[PDB]
Structure 1
């Protein structure tokens, strides 16, 4: 996943540090995730809901 064209480290992006764009290849046609997929990653509190 290092030097790959995706930020596979999430908060850091150190895998994409110091990477030549001539060495990169297009990882995918697109980058756009589904419209609110981040909500699927939230925790949940069962009491408060």
Structure 2
């Protein structure tokens, strides 16, 4: 995954530090996630709803 051109380290993007744009592959055409997918990531408190 290093130098995918995708930040596969979550918060750090350390897999993309000092990475040459000649080595970065065009991993995908686009990077727009579905319009609110991040909410699926969230946790839920079943008592308080």
TM-score range, shorter chain: over 0.9
Spell out, residue by residue over 1:1-49, the C-alpha distance to the aligned partner (whole angstroms, 9 max, x if none): 0111000001000000000001111000000000000000000000000
- Does the CA-based 8 Å contact 2:3-2:25 persist in structure 1? no
* Match runs of 1:1-49 below 5 Å: 1-49=1-49
TM-score by length of 2: 0.96
How many pairs are equivalent?
A: 49
TM, length-normalised to structure 1? 0.96
Unaligned residue ranges in structure 2 (runs of 5+): none
Is there any run of 5+ residues in structure 1 with no aligned partner, and where? none
